């Protein structure tokens, strides 16, 4: 690109129109514009905000359990909360709700967040699926335009530019933008699932009045498995 | 569902269409011999049932 | 639909952008589109009858021209006849104003007098009927999309052998090849931007109709049970956080 | 192959041999001769004939239902049944056997018909898979021949004709004959399985002893499952 | 040598003659570099997944499948019922006085006459059947892998040939033969995949089915002889088992 | 099962190979014209934003 | 791996290299920028689905599948009935005197001899089996992802090189070599996809199946050992489970 020549040599209104507009049309035929904006919103929060470390969550849950055991079920409202899910857990525990209702609410939030991440992954994987099809369509369009105008170089140039740059844009958007965003959304979904499971188990242990010594051992049972197994011997 | 076709076939079609584009380009700044284009045209006519 | 106005705008913009290099006549041919569509119709008709293809087309028409009722107006209406039943029994349901065929059928079966099991079975049968109908329409348009590029390439091959049988001017071979390839271009365009998108909007409308019909069935079952609108509000709004609208809430 | 102007252009013995004989060889390596001939017979039967309409099947079933209700298991002998499976069912009913054994036999026959149709579909899908591969082999052979003898015009023509017609024949056979035949075989499989399940339910309901009108309703329930549900408005 | 193999050999011969007639000669469909690329890369990839012993075993089983025709089940059933009569009117010791053309049947007969009980005889015969099935499955896997890799290797070799042709491209009006040589690698991959390796794997699957059926019939007959059942009863049992095992398309 | 490419993709690679080799055939008897090459090169740097 | 298999691998590789050599200069097919494009792009795309720890774990598990062969099932049954006989003629402490053949088997017999219940040992062995199976699946996923992205990055590099060549032609006799260099990226992507990454993914899947079979056999054997069953019964059951 910059070493090959410049970024300026990959700019074309026709190629952008074909690839991006056709992809947007195809995707909007199966997704809502507001819903697509919501998927963009969740992708941006996944890219601009790192997921909380599971170890840090475990440690702070243990600290919260210590505070609860020392000062009853209302001792967690005077010091800062990291995430919104844990904040909701705290403000449901402060209401003296039973274990079943808070568990159901947390399991509803977990399912909702999992669904949102899965649907954002689906939106961006639809984009990545349609971009190379639009690139091939652009290759066909450019080939037709070249073969129709082999006597006119002024038409040969733009036609081949469209044919090449539609494929280049489709490939770049598919393999370096859309599929990577879907993969990052899947990773962020897995991190969300782990964090939500940890937080729900911590709230469950706090409600039961369990001493934090057992709580930390129980919470450690999640981090030693899963997608991270390639790091664990 | 049918398994579909392997990825190398997609690579092969992308390469074929790319080479098509570039050979159309090469033939754009070229002058076909009209004398040698009618022997080939007659041979294709002979081999396709017309002649 | 807003996505449909965007559809029209995108169609216009992409055609105008595509045809700037030469004339619109290069990318426009009735013979090529006729070849692709006719071959696709013939192939699909060996696996769908005339009535089942016309059914898929008419359900596609309903899914495009019309718009599914929103699942919030449904909650509002359902709690309205719930209040009506709580105040004056099922005898107040018939005088209500209903613009939904499925809800109208449900309440018209309810007034007659039937227990939970039979009305639930009838509503589930209707839901399964509409679900299968939309699924088969999606299958029809998936078949069209699967076969359109193949038919376009068959048309291109026929055009190429017609060109290699008629070769005089070295300068006409290029336009002849472009016209032959136009069929492949049309097959790709019809596959990716018409038939597969129609199948996707049919599946989307299937999901929307299934959600609306489950909403209505639960509302009618609650009304027959005589439950108050309070718990009905929660047990009906909880269905609004699934699917893709779940991805829409922030 | 008519849009070229006539048929005499789209005919080569060489291309036909490469595509058809290669496909036949590959399919005969995949399938036995008996399997291939049975697939041909079942395809011919699916195309030249029509499965019995379910409406007439339910009408006939309620006819023998009322007949058995007026005369128990002895009246069924004296009316004509044009369907082999229904005749077999009523014979296994009237020969004094219990519901379990006749149901098992009818299930075995249904599974046999289903497997026969599935294997015929597999044979024609193998044909439709190999035909484009043979077209590509013919294209490669013809293109090597054409590019090698570029200085020999009389060798260029036939080589490109073989290359092109092999691909045209492979595409036409795959997408307009073999895959359509396989799809029609699947359609006939679904029709035959539905009809045979209808007949089995009618036979079991006559065996039990059931009201003709509830039998009719239960059978009408089967008329809204699948592509007839698509057709029904 | 079934008709499918015979049809394939005549088809390949006619294909070679056809290629030679179209191209004038045959020496232009032969390129040492293309053969080397396809064969060597395919062997490399397949040996990344199978051992040399597995490759040799697959080759041997393919050769045995294409050279020795499987015994017909009806002939085997006739042989078992004849042996049933012989053992009924001559005892177990009578089984060593007639020739048996089937090695699995001979092994079962030796295990039967050597005084082994039914349990060990059945276990050993089942082990032999499982070993044969595993050998056929392994051969099918090796040739399936060859069929999977040959066209990928052919496209790699065609890329190599295209790079070679383009590097030596001045005034492209002589690139015809070089492009043909580049295409030869994909031609080799296509022919080897669709017409050789996949057909061998499919014939090995069919031969697995045939050998499983034959060996199971032989095991049933041998076990029936072990218990000394009546020859008519075991004939009926074997005929029924053969008929119910027939594929639906053949019925 | 992991998906793949449509079944027509092999026919597409076929067609692309056929057209590519047809253009190679046309380029076999076609002499280059340098003036057209200069025009096409200028059009290429104009259509690629290289001026 | 076996010496014969290794010699076959080297022979195939040498046949490919000699074919490339016989087709002209070998510096025509060598470009540092192209291999950097393919490898760096593949790494960039794959690192957005797998962390560096996961990539290195997959690399290690694929490497130890090329230098270690899965233990043969028959050897496993023979050995498990061997320590079965040892336990019958001796005790559970007799198992300690038996030297190391498989780490999974070794840790299983250690957890059996250190005084644990049958069910807890079964649960631990099941957890280990699942961990190894998922590790093999993750390694297969890493290498499948590499094989999926390598052709994509190769085509991206080819398209970029060709766009750069068309941006400034200036010479017709230089067109061909420029496209050759641009195609080198596609060549490298195809070679890495079909000769390195996809074969390693398939090999890891095959070893996943073999390891699951071997570890299930070992688990059943040690469970029977804690049961104290007749070693002949154990052998018959395991041989039946083979088929
Ligand atoms: Na393009
Ligand atoms: Na083809």
Author numbering:
A (entry chain E), D (entry chain B): 20 to 252
B (entry chain F), F (entry chain G): 11 to 61
C (entry chain A): 3 to 252
E (entry chain C): 1 to 251
G (entry chain D): 1 to 243
Which statements did the authors publish about this structure?
Vibrio spp. are highly motile bacteria responsible for various human diseases, the polar flagella of which are exclusively driven by sodium-dependent stator units (PomAB). The flagellar stator unit uses the transmembrane ion motive force (IMF) to generate mechanical torque to rotate the flagellum, which is employed by many bacteria to direct their locomotion in liquid environment or on viscous surfaces to a favorable niche. PomAB assembles the characteristic bell shape of the stator unit family, with conserved 5:2 subunit stoichiometry and overall architecture. Five PomA molecules arrange pseudo-symmetrically around two PomB, with each PomA subunit comprising four transmembrane helices (TM1-TM4) folded into two radial layers.
Single-particle analysis yielded an overall resolution of VaPomAB in Lauryl Maltose Neopentyl Glycol (LMNG) detergent of ~2.5 Å, with the cryo-EM map of sufficient quality to build an atomic model for most of the protein complex. The local resolution corresponding to the inner transmembrane domain approaches 2 Å, with clear density for non-protein molecules, allowing us to model water molecules and ions, as well as residue side chains isomers. The plugged motifs from two PomB chains are fully resolved in our PomAB structure, where they are positioned on the top of the periplasmic side of the stator unit, consistent with a plugged autoinhibited state. The PomAB structure shows that the D24 of two PomB chains sit in different environments; D24 of Pom B chain 1 interacts with PomA, which we refer to as an engaged state; while D24 of PomB chain 2 points towards the cytoplasmic domain and breaks the interaction with PomA, which we refer to as a disengaged state. Examination of the high-resolution density map in the vicinities of these two aspartates reveals nonresidue densities. In site 2, near the disengaged PomB D24, which is more flexible as indicated by the slightly blurred EM density of its acidic side chain, a globular density is well coordinated by oxygen atoms exclusively contributed by PomA TM3 and TM4: side chain hydroxyl groups of T158, T185 and T186, and exposed backbone carbonyl groups of G154 and A182, with an average distance between the density center and associated oxygen of 2.33 Å. To further validate the model, we performed two explicit solvent all-atom MD simulations (1 µs for each) and observed that the Na+ ion in site 1 was very stable, but the other Na+ ion in site 2 rapidly moved to an intermediate site formed by the side chain of D24, T158, and T186 and subsequentially to a location symmetric to site 1, and finally released to the cytoplasmic space.
